[PDB]
Amino acid sequence: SGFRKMAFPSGKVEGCMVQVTCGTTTLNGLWLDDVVYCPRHVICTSEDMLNPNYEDLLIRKSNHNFLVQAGNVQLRVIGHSMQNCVLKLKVDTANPKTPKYKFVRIQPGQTFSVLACYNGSPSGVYQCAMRPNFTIKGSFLNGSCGSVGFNIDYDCVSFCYMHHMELPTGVHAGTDLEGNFYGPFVDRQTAQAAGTDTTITVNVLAWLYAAVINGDRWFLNRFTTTLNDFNLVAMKYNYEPLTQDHVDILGPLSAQTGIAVLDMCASLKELLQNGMNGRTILGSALLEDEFTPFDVVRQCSG
Amino acid sequence: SGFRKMAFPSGKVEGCMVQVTCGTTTLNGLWLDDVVYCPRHVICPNYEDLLIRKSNHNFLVQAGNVQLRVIGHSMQNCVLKLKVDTANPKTPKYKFVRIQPGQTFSVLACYNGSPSGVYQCAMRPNFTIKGSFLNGSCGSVGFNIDYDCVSFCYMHHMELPTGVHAGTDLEGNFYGPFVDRQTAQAAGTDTTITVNVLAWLYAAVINGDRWFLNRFTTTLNDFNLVAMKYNYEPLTQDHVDILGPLSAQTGIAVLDMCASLKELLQNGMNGRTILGSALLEDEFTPFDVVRQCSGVTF
Ligand SMILES: O=C1[C@H](c2cccc(Cl)c2)CCN1c1cncc2ccccc12
Ligand SMILES: O=C1[C@H](c2cccc(Cl)c2)CCN1c1cncc2ccccc12
Ligand SMILES: [Cl-]
């Protein structure tokens, strides 16, 4: 019993964190086999940050300009290449702690663990979701660039995020491990803003099923709804549309609890209308949207 | 910017998790040097009588895909110590520490000696933890990291009828009035960790959330009267002193923040949130707020 915002054990990712220094800039790198991955903006000063021509800045660099530090050992950079917004620093030593890994690009609503790092040293681990507006509500200070987001289903680490930037609202933007940004963001200081954020509906429903599995049923009602009427109501509370894919994905939780997805949708409609009335659901007074249907099954069943 | 419930990096603890099997029971063990620590209910009650009947080979200890050989066994309070022939090469610098209610720690939840998740939590004033544990999680540990030293503070033993959890420090002493036996046991009435709520209000101020601040201050005695009425732990002079750095950083005296908390308790949030929460969060200590809002590494 119990329901916690749970991150994956970070050990496999900790053994990959390194410090990358370029001139005055110091940030984090991910050392896998003989390559160190890091944000390409490590080659920028902060003055050439408004409109940097990364190809032009990178061609002027030599391998010895990049100082890579893995613990108290300086790694030797033997090559460099840029792939989208990530810099790939070929080093002369393969990381002996390299876990089984994959680079996966995630979709909005997906969750992952973040190993926040400063100077190549892990300081904390927390659980995140990719918001529908492609930002993450992280906890990052200056120096955290290059910190990574991941999932560890089974023994394979799936890297899905690399931190690059903080937007003016305090939210964060970054790329997959191929250097492609999530969202319409660019790695430059031009005026950028997170789009209006919406609640991840399928995740809220999964969390309502988690509460039912944990013995809480107060919010359930005798009503059902059509998928269209649910979405017409959902949109008015800035909730993401619920697709037939999401209804299908919620199938196992529906079968386990005996509450049809559209029946749980009618509970959600009622909660949106009434609020909680001094009550909580899984120790929360707000509807939680950073647990996917997959997270709920993993945590509640194994 | 941002404020998350953040756990310590679990790597140093992952290298210590093993699976302990005895009879039909399978649970987790903590392998440090040549000893595996696990709950004594794995033998299970007269635990001295049950243990004397067990031989070393009855305990099957598995570290990954390698079976460890048990060369001795002894009991210390509600913890069983299984001497093994091999010292754990991944043994970090560590200490066994007993924590106080209100202190926080990271839990590395495990099943079959394999770490499955890490979460942060606090020792409640009623000595329970609001954890997330299924059957098979016994022996999962709670810890903090101080520089490069892992301080083990908790070992999971059981789940109470309300879904909350009870366990021991690594010396086998239970937190709370609990016993490791199937009997009627209930978590006592819980209270809110006042010093932690204040630390979280300072974290919200540091993050740009000031709506709850007011011009008022209060005496410590008047605040404790209000706090007692709302099932909040008494705020001591030690807690006021501990909150000093955050008070100096934000420019809001501890008793000034106490007057914000009093108004929040009497009037509610009024549809507003603080750090994305509609409830007052009490599972961040003043040290956790300083560590996160200043980026300390391990
Ligand atoms: O946002 C940025 C900077 C930046 C600027 C423009 C484009 C890029 Cl790709 C990156 C680089 C550091 N950084 C930060 C990243 N995360 C958290 C932070 C907190 C407080 C100050 C800064 C922070
Ligand atoms: O509470 C117990 C049992 C127990 C019984 C008597 C004495 C002791 Cl010390 C412990 C052993 C397993 N266990 C659990 C431990 N944590 C979470 C759980 C969740 C769901 C079911 C069980 C759980
Ligand atoms: Cl995805």
Could you outline the blueprint of secondary structure elements for this entry?
The structure is a homodimer.
Chain A: H1 11-14, E1 17-22, E2 25-32, E3 35-39, H2 54-59, E4 66-70, E5 73-75, E6 77-83, E7 86-91, E8 100-103, E9 111-118, E10 121-129, E11 148-151, E12 156-166, E13 172-175, H3 201-213, H4 227-235, H5 244-249, H6 251-257, H7 261-274, H8 293-301
Parallel strand pairs in A: 8-12
Antiparallel strand pairs in A: 1-2, 1-4, 2-3, 3-7, 4-5, 6-7, 9-10, 9-11, 11-12, 12-13
Helix pairs in contact in A: 3-6, 3-7, 3-8, 4-7
The complex binds (3S)-3-(3-chlorophenyl)-1-(isoquinolin-4-yl)pyrrolidin-2-one (2 copies) and chloride ion.
PDB class: viral protein
Keywords: Diamond Light Source, I04-1, COVID Moonshot, CMD, Mpro, fragment screening, PanDDA, XChemExplorer, viral protein
Assembly: dimeric
